């Protein structure tokens, strides 16, 4: 427990040595679309593309890709809202990955903390590989750049607020 | 969930679940022997058990397979389970959920409006009517399902330890079909009709 630690056996001291806080992170808590993937070849063919990637719509407009899962970017976040207040981030992930993103959901999986057998001692048994994040503080305020980003519309950011403590977008 | 699941290839539908469905009967032949009691088995009583298998579901949106489902849970309960019910159904897969088991004790019929000559009638009661206890006799033949749990007082009020109370419905599950899985729970369910004094509250 004690000697030396990452940063999970840190998150869960905090959890134990207090109960006001462990109830207040149970309340926030409590309270199936058919989706073929991929993309990047309409793109080339009007214009440019010149790199494959979501961050291409960064650069630019968002409308440089396929624009039916411009159409995912809302509507799918928005089940993800419903999710999220219904407890969990990797049932979120799961419906995220039906989203068409699969580089964009790296970003929840962000939002583990390192859990590892080199660096946790009680977390070294139900786990014996490397997870989660161990820069997951520069993570967080990565993360919540996002949350204001105005390139960004709410229909994705509001769910990165929510990762790094939620501002109400 | 449903992820590519396509109009394209429906081809992947015949590996995806058939890989499993092989594990399936691997099992329940054990106790379909009926004549012969126990066969090999490969230790796969512990495998196979609980929320596991299930996850294949949501074929209810587009077709890979869209009857290979149904198969799960009438076959992987064995004989062992007239004591206890391990948990192959009370939670499934994303979305949605296997619903066409009730619609084994009857025809495959209520979408259609004719029979389709859906399978699984056999093995479904290969595994209903030869396996007894709160399970898989809570949720058909009288019941709703919470296994282990039903007591209409006739019986200690306490969780189940004097058991009159659930005997009730595995006494019509002990039929001929059974072999020795009944042949003695026909000795304990002679006391409920048993003129003595017992029916003035066993009659239920």
């Given at each position: 427990?004690?000697?030396?630690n990452?940063?999970?056996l840190?998150?869960?001291?905090?959890?134990q040595?207090?109960?006001?806080?462990?109830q207040?992170?149970?309340?926030?808590?409590?309270?199936?679309?058919?989706?073929?993937?991929?993309?990047?070849?309409?793109?080339?063919?009007?214009?440019?593309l010149?790199?494959?990637?979501?961050?291409?719509?960064?650069?630019?407009?968002?409308?440089?890709?396929?624009?039916?899962?411009?159409?995912?970017?809302?509507?799918?976040?928005?089940?993800?809202?419903?999710?999220?207040?219904?407890?969990?981030?990797?049932?979120?992930?799961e419906?995220?990955?039906?989203?068409?993103?699969?580089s964009?959901?790296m970003?929840?999986?962000?939002?583990?903390?390192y859990?590892?057998?080199?660096?946790?001692?009680?977390?070294?048994?139900?786990?014996?590989?490397?997870?989660?994040?161990?820069?997951?503080?520069?993570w967080?305020?990565?993360?919540?750049?996002?949350?204001?980003?105005?390139?960004?519309?709410?229909?994705?950011?509001?769910?990165?607020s929510?990762?790094?403590?939620?501002?109400?977008? | 969930?449903?992820?590519?699941?396509?109009?394209?290839?429906?081809?992947?539908?015949?590996?995806?679940?058939?890989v499993m469905?092989?594990?399936?009967?691997?099992?329940?032949?054990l106790?379909?022997?009926?004549?012969?009691?126990?066969?090999?088995?490969?230790?796969?009583?512990?495998?196979?058990?609980?929320?596991?298998?299930?996850?294949?579901?949501?074929?209810?949106?587009?077709?890979?397979?869209?009857?290979?489902?149904?198969?799960?849970?009438?076959?992987?309960?064995?004989?062992?389970?007239?004591?206890?019910?391990?948990?192959?159904?009370?939670?499934?897969?994303?979305?949605k959920?296997?619903?066409f088991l009730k619609?084994?004790?009857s025809?495959?019929?209520?979408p259609?409006?004719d029979?389709n000559?859906?399978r699984?009638?056999?093995?479904f009661?290969?595994?209903?009517?030869?396996?007894?206890?709160?399970?898989?006799?809570?949720?058909?033949?009288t019941?709703?399902?919470?296994?282990?749990?039903?007591?209409?007082?006739?019986?200690?009020?306490?969780?189940?330890?004097?058991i009159?109370?659930?005997?009730?419905?595995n006494?019509?599950?002990?039929?001929?079909?059974?072999?020795?899985?009944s042949?003695?729970?026909?000795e304990?369910?002679?006391?409920?009709?048993?003129?003595?004094?017992?029916?003035?509250?066993?009659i239920?």
């Amino acid at each position: 427990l004690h000697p030396y630690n990452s940063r999970g056996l840190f998150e869960k001291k905090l959890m134990q040595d207090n109960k006001q806080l462990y109830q207040i992170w149970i309340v926030m808590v409590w309270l199936p679309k058919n989706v073929p993937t991929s993309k990047w070849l309409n793109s080339i063919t009007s214009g440019g593309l010149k790199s494959c990637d979501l961050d291409f719509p960064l650069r630019e407009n968002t409308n440089v890709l396929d624009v039916k899962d411009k159409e995912e970017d809302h509507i799918f976040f928005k089940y993800i809202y419903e999710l999220i207040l219904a407890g969990a981030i990797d049932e979120a992930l799961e419906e995220a990955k039906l989203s068409d993103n699969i580089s964009i959901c790296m970003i929840l999986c962000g939002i583990q903390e390192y859990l590892n057998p080199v660096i946790d001692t009680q977390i070294a048994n139900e786990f014996n590989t490397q997870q989660g994040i161990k820069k997951h503080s520069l993570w967080r305020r990565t993360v919540y750049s996002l949350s204001q980003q105005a390139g960004l519309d709410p229909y994705e950011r509001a769910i990165y607020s929510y990762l790094s403590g939620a501002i109400p977008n | 969930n449903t992820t590519t699941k396509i109009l394209g290839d429906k081809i992947l539908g015949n590996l995806y679940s058939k890989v499993m469905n092989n594990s399936f009967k691997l099992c329940t032949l054990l106790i379909a022997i009926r004549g012969s009691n126990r066969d090999l088995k490969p230790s796969n009583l512990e495998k196979l058990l609980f929320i596991n298998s299930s996850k294949l579901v949501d074929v209810y949106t587009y077709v890979h397979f869209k009857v290979q489902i149904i198969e799960l849970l009438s076959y992987l309960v064995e004989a062992p389970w007239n004591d206890d019910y391990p948990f192959l159904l009370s939670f499934l897969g994303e979305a949605k959920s296997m619903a066409f088991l009730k619609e084994v004790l009857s025809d495959l019929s209520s979408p259609v409006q004719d029979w389709n000559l859906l399978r699984s009638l056999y093995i479904f009661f290969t595994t209903l009517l030869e396996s007894k206890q709160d399970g898989l006799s809570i949720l058909f033949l009288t019941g709703q399902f919470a296994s282990n749990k039903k007591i209409n007082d006739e019986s200690s009020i306490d969780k189940k330890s004097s058991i009159l109370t659930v005997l009730q419905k595995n006494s019509l599950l002990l039929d001929s079909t059974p072999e020795e899985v009944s042949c003695k729970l026909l000795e304990t369910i002679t006391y409920v009709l048993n003129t003595w004094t017992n029916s003035k509250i066993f009659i239920k």
